[PDB]
């Protein structure tokens, strides 16, 4: 599974399983038992520009914490205030999603690291992907390592 | 916190010049240095800015300095190359540091270093 | 892109400064968290002082203020001190080279 999301090199290690954030909180959350790898890489290259697109996003507010490979694409405005919002922005009331903010010349600690989430079944499941594993002649009737 | 520099220099129009700026107190990976040229009597002008990670080598839109800027991070040296020297070309260079992102990402400086292209 | 500040303005002590930075093209930008403001004294090379109050605000006199919007970024300060006084610059930001502004310097008379 390829999993493509954006966020700051210190957010990368606020989404680890077993490890609590406040990106892990609200916008993505990783599961402490989840089996698989997270490979980070800087983006500051490309993803940062002089131009700044605030395309990327992340959620600044949720009401509740997220379940672990769960996603949410609410947009409604929280409801911190006693006041309701009405669905748009009000005294007390903060929008869910903050727009992403980020420099061409950012420094390491700052810098937007796109993040990919692998998540594999392994064992008990039938093998539609493979390794190279270059396939040697099975052997029968011998005691031999099979794999 | 320290920003060192290279002092003044001499050289003839046409020619090019390596130029210095030791930085102290602080990782040079983490962060980024630019090279700022203030003409004296006159407002300062900003040639590039350097992305942490890699040289960005920014050049500015419309007229070009033509200066290249590189950063060594074991050296934690900021290095810049002026070529096609002339007397407009002349003015006080500044290395300044950056910050976390935000409005402006600088705040310390290099005192500054007089430039004379000359005869 | 383009960036231009007040020709002159000259002042005195306890007096509330305000220069004009005149931006030309568009106004901030779509983050609306942009733009610089700086001091240079003689012999003290310049200095941060307010970028929009987005962070590192201690360090700085709270006399120091201001905001901006539009094409012209407000400057804000209250009981300036006869020795403060330098040409306060208000670097460009996101577009096109930063740029900085023209230059105005403060002279109290007496």
């Known amino acids: 599974y390829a999993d493509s999301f954006v966020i700051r090199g210190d957010e990368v290690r606020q989404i680890a399983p077993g490890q609590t954030g406040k990106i892990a909180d609200y916008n993505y959350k990783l599961p402490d038992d989840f089996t698989g790898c997270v490979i980070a890489w800087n983006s500051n290259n490309l993803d940062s520009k002089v131009g700044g697109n605030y395309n990327y996003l992340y959620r600044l507010f949720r009401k509740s914490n997220l379940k672990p490979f769960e996603r949410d694409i609410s947009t409604e405005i929280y409801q911190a205030g006693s006041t309701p919002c009405n669905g748009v922005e009000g005294f007390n009331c903060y929008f869910p999603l903050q727009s992403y903010g980020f420099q061409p010349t950012n420094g390491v600690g700052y810098q937007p690291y796109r993040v990919v989430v692998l998540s594999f079944e392994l064992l008990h499941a039938p093998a539609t992907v493979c390794g190279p594993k270059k396939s040697t002649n099975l052997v029968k009737n011998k005691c031999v390592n099979f794999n | 916190v320290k920003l060192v520099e290279s002092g003044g220099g001499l050289v003839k129009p046409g020619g090019s010049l390596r130029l210095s700026c030791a930085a102290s107190?602080?990782?040079?990976?983490?962060?980024?240095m630019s090279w700022v040229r203030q003409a004296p009597g006159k407002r300062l002008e900003w040639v590039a800015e350097?992305?942490?990670?890699?040289?960005?080598?920014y050049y500015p839109d419309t007229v070009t300095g033509r200066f290249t800027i590189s950063r060594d991070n074991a050296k934690n040296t900021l290095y810049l190359q002026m070529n096609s020297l002339r007397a407009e070309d002349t003015a006080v260079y500044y290395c300044?540091?950056?910050?976390?992102?935000?409005?402006?990402?600088?705040?310390?400086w290099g005192q500054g270093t007089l430039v004379t292209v000359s005869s | 892109i383009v960036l231009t500040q007040s020709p002159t303005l000259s002042l005195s002590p306890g007096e509330r400064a305000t220069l004009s930075c005149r931006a030309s093209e568009s106004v901030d930008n779509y983050g609306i968290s942009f733009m610089n403001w700086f001091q240079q004294k003689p012999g003290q090379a310049p200095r941060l002082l307010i970028y929009?109050?987005?962070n590192q605000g201690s360090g700085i006199p709270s006399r120091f203020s201001g905001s901006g919007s539009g094409t012209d970024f407000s400057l804000t300060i209250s009981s300036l001190e006869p020795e403060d006084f330098a040409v306060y610059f208000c670097?460009?930001?996101?577009?096109?080279?930063?740029?900085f502004g023209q230059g105005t310097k403060v002279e109290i008379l007496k």
């Open positions: 107190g602080f990782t040079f990976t983490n962060y980024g």
């Open positions: 670097q460009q930001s996101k577009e096109v080279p930063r740029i």
């Open positions: 929009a109050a987005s």
């Open positions: 300044a540091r950056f910050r976390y992102g935000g409005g402006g990402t600088v705040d310390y």
């Open positions: 350097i992305s942490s990670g890699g040289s960005y080598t």
